[PDB]
Amino acid sequence: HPETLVKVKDAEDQLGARVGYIELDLNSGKILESFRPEERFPMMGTFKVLLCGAVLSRIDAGQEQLGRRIHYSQNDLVEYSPVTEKHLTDGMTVRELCSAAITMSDNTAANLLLTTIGGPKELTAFLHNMGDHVTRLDRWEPELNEAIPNDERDTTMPVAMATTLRKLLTGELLTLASRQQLIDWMEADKVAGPLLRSALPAGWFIADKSGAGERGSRGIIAALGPDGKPSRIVVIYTTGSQATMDERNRQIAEIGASLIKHW
């Protein structure tokens, strides 16, 4: 709805920053609404979804096991590792690392997973292999959040991220069982509450993943819909703002409210 683009516009106003926005039909994949859809934005933590899709892909092909245990040391910890911090001693399984990266935004788990698959370049080739020639990962956590202006490293475009997400969750690239595991981790969010979830009506589905970076970078990807099932994909990125975290959350929440209200 154009009333939503009015809201997106206002948010750029308020934040004094670029907002990238897209709304995509899950079923048809058609573009419903857009705003800067082919501009680049840093992914920040929203890459972790893609990352665990690649892992799941390996597990579907027999080259990885969800139950495999990964051991690491205090040397591996990066800033913000709620879950990995706690299990230095005994290690964690692949399942538990994907759960922590996605449900708790644990930075070390992402790094450990990135290692297991061959690094940023391997993720990028995975993405390329499925038709996403725009999205690219170049660094590890936490340097991939630097958000240097005009830098193409670790960026995507709203359109590219959206259609890639669609494929992860509806195409034949992943087994049914793997796909649902993904949605399950995303549906279990503990950090994205003051974003889209705070405007979502009762009974609606949402599976999401948010990101934060330097230089006022904030972002979120999600699949949402009424009556308990996803109907569309929404992607919102922003960067270059001097606004506080809470004012950045509010505007994204307001974009959410207007999209739901004009559903």
**At what resolution in Å was this solved?**
2.1
The count of other CB atoms within 10 Å of the CB of residue 82 is 16
* Residue 11 one-letter amino acid: A
Q: Is the peptide bond before 142 cis (omega within 30 degrees of 0)?
A: yes
Tell which phi-psi region holds residue 214, choosing left (phi > 0), alpha (psi between -120 and 50) or beta: beta
Euclidean distance between CA atoms 258 and 250, whole angstroms? 12
Q: Are strands 218-225 and 232-239 parallel, antiparallel or unpaired?
A: antiparallel
Q: Which residues contact residue 63 at a Cβ distance below 8 angstroms, ignoring those fewer than 6 apart?
A: none
Euclidean distance between CA atoms 39 and 19, whole angstroms? 10
Q: Give the DSSP per-residue string, 206-221.
A: EEEEEEE-STT-EEEE
Residue extents of the structural domains in the chain: 1-263
Using an 8 Å Cβ cutoff, are 216 and 240 in contact?
yes
Euclidean distance between CA atoms 57 and 12, whole angstroms? 37
Using an 8 Å Cβ cutoff, are 190 and 24 in contact?
no
- Method by which the coordinates were obtained: X-ray
Euclidean distance between CA atoms 179 and 225, whole angstroms? 18
Euclidean distance between CA atoms 72 and 74, whole angstroms? 7
Three-state SS at 24:
strand
Euclidean distance between CA atoms 123 and 89, whole angstroms? 28
Phi, psi of 24 (to 5 degrees): -125, 130
The residue ranges of DSSP E strands in the chain, in sequence order, are 18-25, 31-35, 41-42, 69-70, 92-93, 155-156, 205-212, 218-225, 232-239
Domain made up of 1-263: CATH architecture: 3-Layer(aba) Sandwich (3.40)
Write the CA distances from 229 to 121, 187, 224, 241, integer angstroms. 34, 11, 7, 34
C-alpha neighbours within 13 Å on the C-beta side of residue 148: 7
* Residue whose pair of structure tokens reads 């505007």 in the numeric block: 251
Euclidean distance between CA atoms 136 and 122, whole angstroms? 10
Using an 8 Å Cβ cutoff, are 18 and 240 in contact?
yes
